[PDB]
Design an enzyme around this catalytic site. Structure first.
Site, mmCIF file in Angstrom:
data_model
loop_
_atom_site.group_PDB
_atom_site.id
_atom_site.type_symbol
_atom_site.label_atom_id
_atom_site.label_comp_id
_atom_site.label_asym_id
_atom_site.label_seq_id
_atom_site.Cartn_x
_atom_site.Cartn_y
_atom_site.Cartn_z
ATOM 1 N N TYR B 26 31.622 -6.567 48.757
ATOM 2 C CA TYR B 26 31.224 -7.981 48.706
ATOM 3 C C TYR B 26 30.627 -8.410 50.039
ATOM 4 O O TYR B 26 30.039 -9.486 50.154
ATOM 5 C CB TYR B 26 32.459 -8.836 48.404
ATOM 6 C CG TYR B 26 32.306 -10.329 48.612
ATOM 7 C CD1 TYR B 26 31.824 -11.155 47.597
ATOM 8 C CD2 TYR B 26 32.691 -10.923 49.818
ATOM 9 C CE1 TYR B 26 31.733 -12.545 47.770
ATOM 10 C CE2 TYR B 26 32.608 -12.310 50.006
ATOM 11 C CZ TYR B 26 32.131 -13.109 48.979
ATOM 12 O OH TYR B 26 32.062 -14.469 49.160
ATOM 13 N N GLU B 91 45.411 -10.959 57.171
ATOM 14 C CA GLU B 91 44.354 -10.018 57.450
ATOM 15 C C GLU B 91 43.158 -10.073 56.474
ATOM 16 O O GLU B 91 42.000 -10.131 56.904
ATOM 17 C CB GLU B 91 44.940 -8.599 57.489
ATOM 18 C CG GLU B 91 43.897 -7.533 57.741
ATOM 19 C CD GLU B 91 43.288 -7.618 59.113
ATOM 20 O OE1 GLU B 91 42.137 -7.142 59.273
ATOM 21 O OE2 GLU B 91 43.956 -8.126 60.044
ATOM 22 N N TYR B 139 39.148 -23.763 55.094
ATOM 23 C CA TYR B 139 40.346 -23.720 55.916
ATOM 24 C C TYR B 139 40.575 -24.988 56.728
ATOM 25 O O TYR B 139 41.719 -25.395 56.946
ATOM 26 C CB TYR B 139 40.292 -22.508 56.818
ATOM 27 C CG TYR B 139 40.517 -21.211 56.106
ATOM 28 C CD1 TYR B 139 41.721 -20.950 55.447
ATOM 29 C CD2 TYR B 139 39.585 -20.186 56.197
ATOM 30 C CE1 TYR B 139 41.989 -19.692 54.916
ATOM 31 C CE2 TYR B 139 39.839 -18.931 55.671
ATOM 32 C CZ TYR B 139 41.043 -18.686 55.038
ATOM 33 O OH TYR B 139 41.305 -17.432 54.555
ATOM 34 N N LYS B 140 39.498 -25.607 57.198
ATOM 35 C CA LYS B 140 39.645 -26.852 57.936
ATOM 36 C C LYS B 140 40.233 -27.899 56.975
ATOM 37 O O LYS B 140 41.075 -28.693 57.359
ATOM 38 C CB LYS B 140 38.299 -27.335 58.487
ATOM 39 C CG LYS B 140 37.917 -26.680 59.813
ATOM 40 C CD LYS B 140 36.546 -27.131 60.340
ATOM 41 C CE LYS B 140 36.353 -26.694 61.792
ATOM 42 N NZ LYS B 140 35.059 -27.194 62.380
ATOM 43 N N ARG B 141 39.785 -27.892 55.723
ATOM 44 C CA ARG B 141 40.300 -28.839 54.741
ATOM 45 C C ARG B 141 41.795 -28.691 54.567
ATOM 46 O O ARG B 141 42.461 -29.593 54.068
ATOM 47 C CB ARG B 141 39.629 -28.650 53.379
ATOM 48 C CG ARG B 141 38.326 -29.454 53.240
ATOM 49 C CD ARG B 141 37.883 -29.538 51.786
ATOM 50 N NE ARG B 141 37.604 -28.226 51.207
ATOM 51 C CZ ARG B 141 36.503 -27.520 51.446
ATOM 52 N NH1 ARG B 141 35.562 -27.999 52.262
ATOM 53 N NH2 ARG B 141 36.339 -26.340 50.863
#
Ligand SMILES: CC(C)(COP(=O)(O)OP(=O)(O)OC[C@H]1O[C@@H](n2cnc3c(N)ncnc32)[C@H](O)[C@@H]1OP(=O)(O)O)[C@@H](O)C(=O)NCCC(=O)NCCS
Ligand SMILES: CC(C)(COP(=O)(O)OP(=O)(O)OC[C@H]1O[C@@H](n2cnc3c(N)ncnc32)[C@H](O)[C@@H]1OP(=O)(O)O)[C@H](O)C(=O)NCCC(=O)NCCS
Ligand SMILES: CCCNCCCNCCCNCC
EC number: 2.3.1.57
Lengths: 168, 170
Positions: B26, B91, B139-141
């Site tokens: 991906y 990870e 992630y900030k959310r």
């Protein structure tokens, strides 16, 4: 000077050096490790991390008689591409004791630990402005993964972890 | 599809490697994956596990065309910072295409957070590429902060060839 793995009695010197390092990193006030924590977590038991210490002979001990003047704290981590890695959490040598080759010896012992435990690489963080250390590592083949591959270390503290855990 | 989140067992290593490769694939890095099933087995299920892994399993009716029941995963381990505390380190985190948008990821982050509370972790650490803005915001959310840029930290590595040179030097 000799590099050797720590001993439960090396604990007070270790904490002392961790604090000197924190100071060097402007992180001294945030230190939360205690001798008690160090003894439990660092020893033989299920040991969370491992420490190495560098000690000099009498003629060069510290004004306080401390012979332990350096240390390295590490643990093992994992990378899905190549597997087991050695992770260097802390590495420090007292100001007056640098440039002697002490740090080089610690990196040598750490490399052997790495080979013995079959680690494919050693990872660690370095402060942007820590020119001296940035070169010390590069001179020994290190590459800045943050520059080369653009990685940025992110963190999500406890209050948000708690929010996600209970959100359901 | 219906799914369950559970810990990976020795029995699941071929699927772990499979998903690692899907994640690499991906990211067009599949050839870089040197890891073998043997490693995943010895490294994660012996006396001292070097990684932990939660997997997402689906029923037989939603198996992958190749007939696989695992469509996502998270690989993690515990680390420590003297000026932070004990940490949960994430990870790898990945869900296959035809299985995203169904709550699988949310669930994984929820169970990882509970694991973190159980282990008394002060925070969860993980890496994100500087240009991956969609991920950065995901992630900030959730309350994440860019510690590398806020505090000036750079990740470095010394590969095997140099570690071997220093291990055997002189
Ligand atoms: C990084 C650190 C732990 C290294 O330990 P150290 O004891 O100074 O390291 P060394 O003595 O082996 O090497 C010192 C240097 O002088 C040279 N040197 C060392 N021994 C020498 C000798 N016997 N003869 C000639 N030159 C020598 C080395 O080549 C190196 O120079 P270079 O940087 O130009 O390559 C440390 O200097 C210190 O603790 N400082 C700051 C805290 C820090 O940044 N910690 C680290 C991690 S992010
Ligand atoms: C993040 C990842 C594990 C998500 O798990 P998931 O099973 O799809 O997600 P969930 O159904 O539990 O829904 C998670 C949510 O993720 C986002 N999401 C859901 N389906 C998505 C999809 N098909 N593609 C991209 N994001 C999706 C939603 O916007 C929501 O995020 P928000 O709360 O910030 O609005 C994911 O698809 C994946 O495996 N990730 C890698 C990279 C990527 O596309 N990153 C970015 C961020 S939005
Ligand atoms: C919120 C306050 C600060 N949190 C953390 C600082 C992050 N990375 C720390 C250090 C490690 N390694 C040194 C070589």
């Amino acid at each position: 000077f000799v590099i050797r793995p720590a001993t439960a009695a090396d604990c007070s010197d270790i904490l002392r050096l961790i604090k000197e390092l924190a100071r060097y990193e402007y992180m001294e006030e945030q230190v939360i490790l205690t001798e008690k924590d160090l003894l439990e977590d660092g020893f033989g038991e299920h040991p969370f991390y491992h420490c190495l210490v560098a000690e000099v002979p009498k003629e060069h001990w510290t004004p306080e008689g401390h012979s332990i003047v350096g240390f390295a704290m590490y643990y093992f981590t994992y990378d899905p591409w190549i597997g087991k890695l050695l992770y260097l959490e802390d590495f420090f040598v007292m100001s007056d004791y640098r440039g002697f080759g002490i740090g080089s010896e610690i990196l040598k012992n750490l490399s052997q630990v790495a080979m013995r435990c079959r680690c494919s690489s050693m990872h660690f963080l370095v402060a942007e402005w820590n020119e001296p250390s940035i070169n010390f590592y590069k001179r020994r083949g290190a590459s800045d993964l943050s520059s080369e591959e653009g990685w940025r270390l992110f963190k999500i503290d406890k209050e948000y972890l708690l929010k996600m855990a209970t959100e359901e």
